[PDB]
Design a protein around this ligand. Structure first.
Ligand code: KA2
Ligand code: KA2
Lengths: 277, 284
């Protein structure tokens, strides 16, 4: 009964428009001339038009604390795009793998990111009807100014009625896809390693995965000093199980993570972030 | 053509660990399915009012506006579910000097910038939304002390009470013109700015509130001197100019939030990013 409409932003209101990246399309940064804030813009064909509008509708409907906030839609004959909040700290991929820029990523912050990814996905799954992301990667887990999570890219997302394959369950070559992706992300967050490092061809990964092989769990990838190592390994191994029926719900995953997050005092999250600056 | 998002209905029984915060009445809880902490603000005429506020919060969604999560609409219970703000209000930050001996200038300037960003957004909506009850009490602070504007009970679409220190003199005897005024929020903002930079209670030496009303209507304002506003305040002259134009007796002489923002942007650029992080750790 209470309906909020997504604003239409005239393209001419986006000042200092600059290229960022390219992929479910091109990302550019800008400032809104009237709102005085920094924004991000994700931008001829008719079928491609419906796709951008579909994504915008999904982001607008799926608004929550751990979902990338949509500010409006650019819907002009000359230009079509999605306006969102600008995320100054990039993606989780950049945080994990830029080891020169980030020598230390403290455990409290790693656990908080993992908790917020699960909170964000759980919300999507609890919607009516449930929304299934179906394209979770470290690349589309964005980080705001204080390194809080914002889930982006709802291009492959589906209402319950390409690129990299390392986050894709073997049966995809389902309400149990996002958990598989999450298990791989957890492994990657705790190891700062690229899954299947020794693999030349992505087909060799697809073959290994279909045979039940997974990123390695040993002392080298996951050192014995990782807080709650046993519990995290259990979560990872259940999450990426060959049998989808054996993978947990996000609820179960969240009930598992809540006692872990309670072991960290609030100031340790602040200290982890200042260490990155 | 319009993309319309519906506000969720939350069954009251999905709110676990419901605990009293303040007195409508504010309670804290956790959503049983979403696994997050929330806040709950809870007759037929009083029903229409809660729904009106919820509609406004849902439509006015922005980075510096309190995010609404859903509505409780049951025969047995009616309330607004929002994100939980762990660091309270700006009032508590400014006046709890034992709990907060220092509040660094970078953080004070960021709060002022975010309040102006939040109000500017409301004023730029179609039709414009005018808050008309801005107080330090309803500028809420999140986990990293970012601003969230709350209380849209007196808010109006441009087409039982408390404090009056943020109210312009022309609004004392209300009507059509008063409810219409597009220069009310800037007056409130000028008083908030003065209060943020001084950490003083506006009209501290005045005992009775009706006497404040008498002074304000004569053109008297909270004092601007070396005691209230020390000479060491960054960008003191510029801030005093903003304050004095914002609370001008003539509403026509008060600036827009755009003008205000354009003045604040060069000020905020003088603070390095780490100083905001340091200001927050100092508060913990
Ligand atoms: C992901 C990055 C870090 C490589 S980026 O430079 O592209 C970047 C992207 C941002 C972004 N992307 C975006 C925009 C609109 C939509 S609609 C659905 N998903 C998206 C995703 N949004 C916000 N801020 C971004 C910041 C980025 O990098 C700047 C810091 O490096
Ligand atoms: C304002 C306080 C700090 C005195 S509080 O204890 O009441 C408090 C309020 C919070 C809050 N309020 C709220 C809830 C729903 C609506 S709908 C329109 N306006 C509101 C305002 N919202 C979120 N978190 C709150 C936290 C509070 O206390 C934190 C500890 O001081």
């Amino acid at each position: 009964a209470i309906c909020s409409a997504l604003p239409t932003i005239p393209y001419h209101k986006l000042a200092d428009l600059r290229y960022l990246s390219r992929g479910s399309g091109t990302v550019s940064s800008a400032r809104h001339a009237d709102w005085r804030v920094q924004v991000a813009v994700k931008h001829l064909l008719d079928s491609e038009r419906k796709d951008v509008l579909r994504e915008a509708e999904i982001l607008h409907k799926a608004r929550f604390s751990y979902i990338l906030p949509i500010l409006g839609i650019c819907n002009e004959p000359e230009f079509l795009g999605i306006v969102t909040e600008y995320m100054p700290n990039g993606s989780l991929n950049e945080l994990l793998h830029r080891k020169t820029e980030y020598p230390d990523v403290a455990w409290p912050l790693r656990f908080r990111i993992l908790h917020e990814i699960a909170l964000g996905v759980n919300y999507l799954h609890n919607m009516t009807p449930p929304l299934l992301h179906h394209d979770l990667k470290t690349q589309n887990i964005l980080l705001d100014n204080e390194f809080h999570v914002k889930i982006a890219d709802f291009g492959l997302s589906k209402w319950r009625m390409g690129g990299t394959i390392i986050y894709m369950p073997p049966e995809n070559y389902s309400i149990k896809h996002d958990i598989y992706s999450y298990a791989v992300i957890t492994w990657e967050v705790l190891s700062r390693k690229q899954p299947f490092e020794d693999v030349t061809n992505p087909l060799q990964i697809m073959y290994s995965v279909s045979q039940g092989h997974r990123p390695v769990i040993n002392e080298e990838s996951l050192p014995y000093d990782i807080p709650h190592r046993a519990r995290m390994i259990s979560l990872i191994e259940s999450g990426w199980a060959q049998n989808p029926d054996e993978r947990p719900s996000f609820l179960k995953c969240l009930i598992e993570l809540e006692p872990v997050l309670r072991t960290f005092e609030e100031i340790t999250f602040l200290e982890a972030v200042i260490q990155l600056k």
